[PDB]
Amino acid sequence: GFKQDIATLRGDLRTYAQDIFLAFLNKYPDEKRNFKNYVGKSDQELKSMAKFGDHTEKVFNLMMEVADRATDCVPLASDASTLVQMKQHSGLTTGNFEKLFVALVEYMRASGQSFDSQSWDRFGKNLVSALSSAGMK
Amino acid sequence: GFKQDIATLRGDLRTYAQDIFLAFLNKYPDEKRNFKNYVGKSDQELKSMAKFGDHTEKVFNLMMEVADRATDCVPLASDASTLVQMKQHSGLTTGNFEKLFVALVEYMRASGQSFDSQSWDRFGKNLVSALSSAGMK
Ligand code: HEM
Ligand code: HEM
């Protein structure tokens, strides 16, 4: 289930983080514009870029902690507040996070591994809800 | 405390894993003989190899899972058994693990962060005991 999935992703986190974030950027090409120097690059070029590798690893390290601290796929309010107050996320909305979780769930369903994709769908919706209550537009 | 330390380390797992492993190898150069692929290389050469980062991240992820499952810094006997039965740990003794934790605690005390270095010292001692009880020489 959900708890074992966190363990599965952590076991190969660098690979999963890059694969899932690329799936997001390719499913929603407009989301590349939030990032500098991502446009015009294929996936293998992105994986060679320092800031891509560093950001995606930090995204997923923290996301797995938020998932780990949730109860029944509902995140702690404090984790939602933490994500809203990050200075780097100045011009983000919940829609950016919504789209990331649609791509993540789609990646899990296509993967052939036994992820609990329904729980991740719930987790993504509940995190978006928490982000809005914490102050994200 | 200890539980926050796990969250700090997991937040930047690949970076901490490499720096701590290098601190171990450089404090105890005899231990590098166990890692034939890493002999003859400086710190920056090792950090530039993908296989070094990949290995240290996987190892450190498992160490954090063991630490997370411990009670009062006492690891589960089942986790100690997993570590003893791993094929890559054939020929290791509890002395190798003791040296790892001396270097870990030294690294935490020098880092200038608010790690609970005393709890990690206790966890290392209790892990060494559990490894003996699970069959390690
Ligand atoms: C979901 C969990 C996320 C976490 C934990 C997270 C975390 C971080 C962190 C630690 C940084 C470091 C600042 C830096 O050096 O760039 C950062 C920057 C950044 N993040 Fe995120 N982020 C998340 C989601 C997103 C999403 C969905 C977007 C969508 C656009 C995004 C866009 C950015 C951007 C644009 C930067 C600044 C780098 C740049 O200007 O290209 N993040 N984020
Ligand atoms: C709590 C402490 C430790 C944990 C959780 C741990 C875990 C692991 C894991 C998961 C692997 C396989 C990694 C991979 O697939 O690349 C591994 C390999 C290995 N470990 Fe450990 N280990 C620990 C302590 C040690 C110590 C103290 C030593 C020696 C001083 C050691 C020596 C080795 C060696 C030689 C390998 C083979 C690496 C290779 O050939 O690629 N381990 N360990």
Author numbering:
A (entry chain B), B (entry chain A): 1 to 137
Show sentences the authors wrote.
Our model protein for comparing methods of RT structure determination is the coelomic hemoglobin from the marine annelid Amphitrite ornata. Named dehaloperoxidase, this O2-transport protein is capable of oxidizing a wide array of substrates by either electron or O-atom transfer. DHP exhibits four activities common to heme proteins, peroxidase, peroxy­gen­ase, oxidase and oxygenase, with each activity employing an Fe(IV)-oxo (ferryl) intermediate. In this study, structures of a multifunctional globin, dehaloperoxidase B (DHP-B), obtained using several methods of room-temperature crystallographic structure determination are described and compared.
As well as this, we present an X-ray crystal structure that was determined from the same crystal as previously used for collection of the neutron data (data set NX-Xray). Following the completion of neutron data collection, RT X-ray diffraction data were collected from the same crystal using an in-house source (NX-Xray). The Fe distance to O-MPEG in the NX-Xray structure is 2.23 Å, which is much shorter than in the NX structure (3.04 Å). During RT data collection, we assume that the ferric heme centre of protomer A was rapidly photoreduced to the ferrous state due to the ionizing properties of the X-ray beam, which is consistent with extensive studies on heme proteins and specifically of DHP. This reduction could lead to displacement of the MPEG molecule as DHP forms the oxyferrous state. The SSX, SLX and NX-Xray structures incurred X-ray doses ranging from 21.8 to 83 kGy. While these are very low doses, small enough to avoid typical site-specific damage to bound ligands or proteins such as decarboxylation of side chains or reduction of disulfide bonds, we expect the photoreduction of the heme iron to occur after just a few kGy. For the SSX, SLX and NX-Xray structures site-specific radiation damage may also be a contributing factor.
